[PDB]
């Protein structure tokens, strides 16, 4: 168990896209963004590592290691300060993604927390939840995938705290995504990303499924809501990787060749829930998948459960 990095209240992230469709990256700005947010990404990467090692069994130390990192940032009031904007709201997005990754690690290692630790972390996770959720009160922020990733931290905090109010708002974020699916299967805000249209349909499917799976922790079958819709979106994503023909036309760009990776590991869960599961064998074969912002190892979590008992 290493030592936790500093939990600054303040974030200064850097947007790195150059075109309106937010699909062409500036390399100079991505390297600058990577360095600016190295401690946020490092915090998520370790605290998920500690959870994966915990879920391997016979390693209560790793679980208690993450709870030390999470408790340290809790008392630092980390990420609750200034979200510095330079050329966009990339800092806000990092708070959304880092909160999620944090809330997942606490959801997964919760059982080993002391009472000083449960109080510190949960109070922090709810005080983050309020912050990230207040961001989306401004109607000028389109509620695209970014909105649905905010639900990862809200949902995990809700289930971890057993807060029925946070459960509903979290359900509202998921349902808002499911409602955004169009009859042809498209999410029009993800479809407007051109050469990354498939990629962002994939990236949009990840928090929706993961939210639905944590709802299973409380016996709720969220795939019931607007049943069949998420299948349509999930199907196009699986179709797009074999043949990007549809995505090419509906986006007006030639999709960017790419193998499924990391966040696209939502398919490890959804294939257990779909009516037509063998359709996702090709994506499943690209595994295993691991993503700190969704809790860690999605392939194992789909087999052993999000929360190891």
- Judged by DSSP in three states, 287 sits in coil
Strand partners, 25: 17
The answer to whether 235 and 185 have CB atoms below 8 angstroms apart is yes
Q: Where are the domains of the chain?
A: 27-304
- Other CB atoms within 10 A of residue 235 CB: 16
Give the up-direction half-sphere exposure of residue 72: CA atoms within 13 A in the CB hemisphere.
15
Helices marked H in 162-274: 164-180, 188-191, 197-216, 229-242, 245-251, 266-270
The count of C-alpha atoms lying within 13 angstroms of the C-alpha of 190, restricted to the half-sphere facing its C-beta, is 26
Mutual angle of helices 90-109 and 145-161, in 10-degree steps = 30
Measured between alpha carbons, how far is 308 from 50 in angstroms, rounded to an integer? 12
CA–CA separation, 32 and 34 (whole Å): 5
3-state secondary structure 72-115: HHHHCCCCCCCEECCCCCHHHHHHHHHHHHHHHHHHHHHHHCCH
- Rounded to an integer, what distance in angstroms lies between the CA atom of residue 170 and that of residue 149? 10
DSSP SS3 for 296? strand
List the one residue out of 139, 141, 4, 146 whose CA is nearest residue 68. 4
């Amino acid at each position: 168990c290493p030592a936790p990095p500093p939990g600054s209240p303040d974030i200064r992230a850097i947007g790195y896209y150059t075109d309106a469709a937010r699909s062409v990256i500036d390399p100079r700005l991505k390297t600058q963004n990577d360095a600016a947010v190295k401690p946020l990404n490092a915090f998520a990467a370790h605290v998920a590592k500690f959870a994966d090692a915990y879920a391997k069994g016979a390693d209560e130390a790793a679980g208690r290691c993450a709870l030390t990192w999470l408790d340290a940032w809790a008392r630092s009031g980390a990420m609750l300060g200034r979200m510095a904007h330079v050329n966009n709201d990339q800092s806000d997005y990092m708070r959304q993604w880092t909160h999620g990754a944090a809330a997942m690690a606490y959801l997964r290692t919760q059982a080993l927390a002391s009472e000083q630790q449960r109080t510190d972390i949960e109070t922090w996770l709810k005080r983050l939840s309020a912050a990230n959720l207040a961001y989306w009160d401004n109607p000028k922020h389109k509620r695209n995938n970014h909105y649905y990733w905010t639900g990862v931290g809200i949902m995990a905090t809700a289930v971890a705290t057993r807060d029925d109010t946070l459960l509903n708002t979290a359900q509202g974020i998921y349902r808002a995504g499911i409602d955004a699916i169009e009859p042809d299967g498209r999410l029009p805000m993800e479809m407007a990303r051109k050469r990354l249209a498939l990629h962002y349909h994939d990236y949009a499917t990840a928090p929706l499924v993961l939210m639905a799976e944590m709802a299973r922790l409380q016996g709720e079958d969220w795939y019931t809501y607007r049943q069949g819709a998420l299948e349509r979106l999930a199907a196009r994503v699986a179709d797009g990787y074999r043949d990007p023909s549809w995505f090419n036309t509906q986006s007006g760009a030639v999709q960017e060749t790419a193998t499924p990776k990391a966040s696209s590991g939502w398919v490890e869960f959804y294939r257990l829930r779909s009516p037509d599961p063998m359709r996702f064998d090709a994506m499943h074969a690209a595994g295993p998948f691991q993503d700190p912002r969704m809790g860690g190892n999605l392939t194992l979590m789909a087999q052993e459960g999000i929360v190891p008992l």
